[PDB]
Each structure stands twice: as C-alpha cells, then as structure tokens.
C-alpha cells in the first residue's frame, strides 16, 4: 500500500515536525484557512478571524493545530495499522462536527506544502509521493468509517 521505504520517507520527514508540533500546526492551519476559507467555518472558537496576523496570534488555533498533527503523527507511526487511532477520529469528524472528506484533502495538501517549504532536504520527489499516499490512505480509511457512522462525507 505504502512500501517499507515509503513509510521510512514518511517517518523521516515526520521526525522534523516533532521538533515543533505547534509551529508546524499553525502553518498547516493558516495554509488551509487561506487556501480554503470555508474550512475555517468549521471551528466555532476562531471562525470570526479574518487575517493571517490574527491566525498567528490565536492560542486556540495553535492548540487545534497541535492536536491535529499530534493525532496524525500517531496514525502515521502505525504505518497503516491504525484502526484503533482512527476510530475516535472518525467518530468526532462525522457526528458533532461534520468534516467533509474533501476538507481532509485540503488539509492533506496543506501538510504536504508546509513539509516541503520547511524541510525540503527531507522531502524530495519520492518522499512527497510517499507522504501523499500515506494521507490518501488515512482519508480513505476515514471515509470508510464515515459510511458506517451514517455521514456521507
Ligand atoms: C489530518 C487531518 C485531521 C486530524 C488528524 C484531526 C484531528 C483531530 C483531533 C485529535 C481532534 C480532537 C478530537 C476531539 O475533539 O475529541 C479534532 C477535532 C475537530 N476537528 Fe479535526 N483533524 C483533522 C482535520 C480536520 C479538518 C480538515 C477540520 C475542518 C476543516 C477539522 C475540524 C475539527 C472540528 C470542528 C473538531 C471538534 C470536533 C469535536 O468537538 O469532537 N479537523 N481533529
Ligand atoms: O483540525 N482540527 O482538528
Ligand atoms: O505545495 N506543495 O508542495
Ligand atoms: O507559501 N509559502 O511557502
């Protein structure tokens, strides 16, 4: 699904995120909210924010971005064997807060963009390819739980 070497390329670049979960989390969310303003409408706590200066100063947004990349790192490090980690994630993105699968695609794109901007010597062509497939797998498995939970994502 991913080869062992693709997982290695994923885990390597991810190691670089661990040195600043929070800074990365902010840059991913700013990239997401700026490329795709409608996604910001999903976060009741900071949906009123308008500009990037405001996003950068939000503690709530920073905390959300830390929680996203913390939960994703846990899932990636399972290297595909992530049924347990995915279960609560699917339940929360499909019930109270309904996150379209398309929005997981937007945030995937934003993660890939930030890793490339920040860690390019750790994220060449094949490594971007691998990360792209690892995120596709994550969304695919999430969409499958969406169905069981009665959310057409
Ligand atoms: C890599 C993709 C993502 C990951 C790993 C992720 C992870 C998480 C985690 C750990 C939580 C806290 C779970 C909890 O509240 O019990 C959460 C909650 C939430 N997320 Fe995400 N998230 C992702 C994508 C998104 C996107 C793209 C959006 C909106 C566009 C979003 C919107 C929300 C909202 C509204 C909540 C609160 C849900 C609740 O009250 O339980 N998430 N996410
Ligand atoms: O994307 N916040 O869970
Ligand atoms: O913008 N993706 O490298
Ligand atoms: O758009 N910042 O690489």
Structure commentary:
The chain has 153 residues and is an all-alpha fold. The chain has a single domain, classed as Globins (Globin-like, Orthogonal Bundle), CATH 1.10.490. It has eight helices and no strands. It has helices at residues 4-18, 21-35, 37-40, 52-57, 59-77, 83-94, 101-118, 125-149. Helix 1 (4-18) crosses helix 8. The structure holds protoporphyrin IX containing FE and nitrite ion (3 copies). The site of one nitrite ion has 3 residues, from helix 7. It is classed as oxygen transport.
| Total beta-strand segments | 0
Q: Report helical residue fraction.
A: over 70%
Question: Terminal Cα separation, in Å?
Answer: 23 Å
Identify the CATH architecture.
Answer: Orthogonal Bundle
Following the backbone from N to C, one meets helices and strands in this order, namely: HHHHHHHH
- Whole-number tally of structural domains: 1
CATH topology label: Globin-like
Give the overall shape: globular
């Amino acid at each position: 699904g991913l080869s062992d070497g693709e997982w290695q390329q994923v885990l390597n670049v991810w190691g670089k995120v661990e040195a600043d979960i929070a800074g990365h989390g902010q840059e991913v969310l700013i990239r997401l909210f700026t490329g795709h303003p409608e996604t910001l409408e999903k976060f009741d706590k900071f949906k009123h924010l308008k500009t990037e200066a405001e996003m950068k100063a939000s503690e709530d947004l920073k905390k959300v971005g830390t929680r996203v990349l913390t939960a994703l790192g846990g899932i990636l490090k399972k290297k595909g064997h992530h049924e347990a980690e995915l279960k609560p994630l699917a339940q929360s993105h499909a019930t109270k807060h309904k996150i379209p699968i398309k929005y997981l695609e937007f945030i995937s794109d934003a993660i890939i963009h930030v890793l490339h901007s920040k860690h390019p010597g750790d994220f060449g062509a094949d490594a971007q390819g691998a990360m792209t497939k690892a995120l596709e797998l994550f969304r695919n498995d999430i969409a499958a739980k969406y169905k069981e939970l009665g959310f057409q994502g």
